[PDB]
Amino acid sequence: LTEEQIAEFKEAFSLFDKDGDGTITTKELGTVMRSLGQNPTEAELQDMINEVDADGNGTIDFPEFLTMMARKMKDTDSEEEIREAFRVFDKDGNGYISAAELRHVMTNLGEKLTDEEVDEMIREADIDGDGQVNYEEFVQMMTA
């Protein structure tokens, strides 16, 4: 790990952990998933948590959250899950995620960000330098 990978991962954790109590619950997981256009059942939420629930307390703490990261880094999400994620961001469907589109998704996740901060995330993911994120750039981002 790097210092900035840890900081990246802690912020990712704090968006699932809505009440900042240190554990992600099925209710918090369900709330995030609905804000990203998904609709898991209560049992699917339990299945997701149980796949990385090391100590069997039914919630996900930061270490378990990291281990999930390293897992989907080894075996990536399926193509269709990555395609679905892209569609969540690319709301006009034109093939490119803009800063405005990234901003709209962050507002649904309850993430406060300046405009420059949104622009920074776009620039980091952009490869060809057109200032937008196409599917290929998105796939590369999501697969480590």
Ligand X SMILES: COc1ccc(S(=O)(=O)N(CCO)c2ccccc2CN(C)C/C=C/c2ccc(Cl)cc2)cc1
List of residues contacting ligand X (CB under 6 A): 4, 7-9, 11-12, 15-16, 24, 29, 32, 36, 38, 48, 60, 65, 68-69, 72, 77, 81, 84-85, 88-89, 97, 102, 105, 109, 111, 120-121, 124-125, 133, 141-142
Count Cα atoms within 13 angstroms, Cβ side, for 47: 5
CB 85 within 8 A of CB 33: no
Could you say which residues in the range 93-112 bind Ca ion, by CB under 5 A? 94, 96
Question: Judged by CB, which is closer to Ca ion: 3, or 20?
Answer: 20
N- to C-terminal Cα distance for the chain? 13
> How far is 38 from 121, CA to CA, in rounded Å?
23
Q: 131 with 122: CB under 8 angstroms? A: yes
Residue 119 touching Ca ion (CB under 5 A):
no
Instruction: Give the sign of the dihedral formed by CA 50, CA 52, CA 56, CA 62.
Output: negative
Of the pair 3, 108, the CB lying nearest Ca ion is at 108
d(CA 11, CA 7): 6
135 marked ligand binding residue: no
Q: Which residues bind Ca ion (CB under 5 A)?
A: 17, 19, 21, 23, 53, 55, 57, 90, 92, 94, 96, 126, 128, 130
User: Residues marked as binding for Ca(2+)?
Assistant: 17, 19, 21, 23, 28, 53, 55, 57, 59, 64, 90, 92, 94, 96, 101, 126, 128, 130, 132, 137
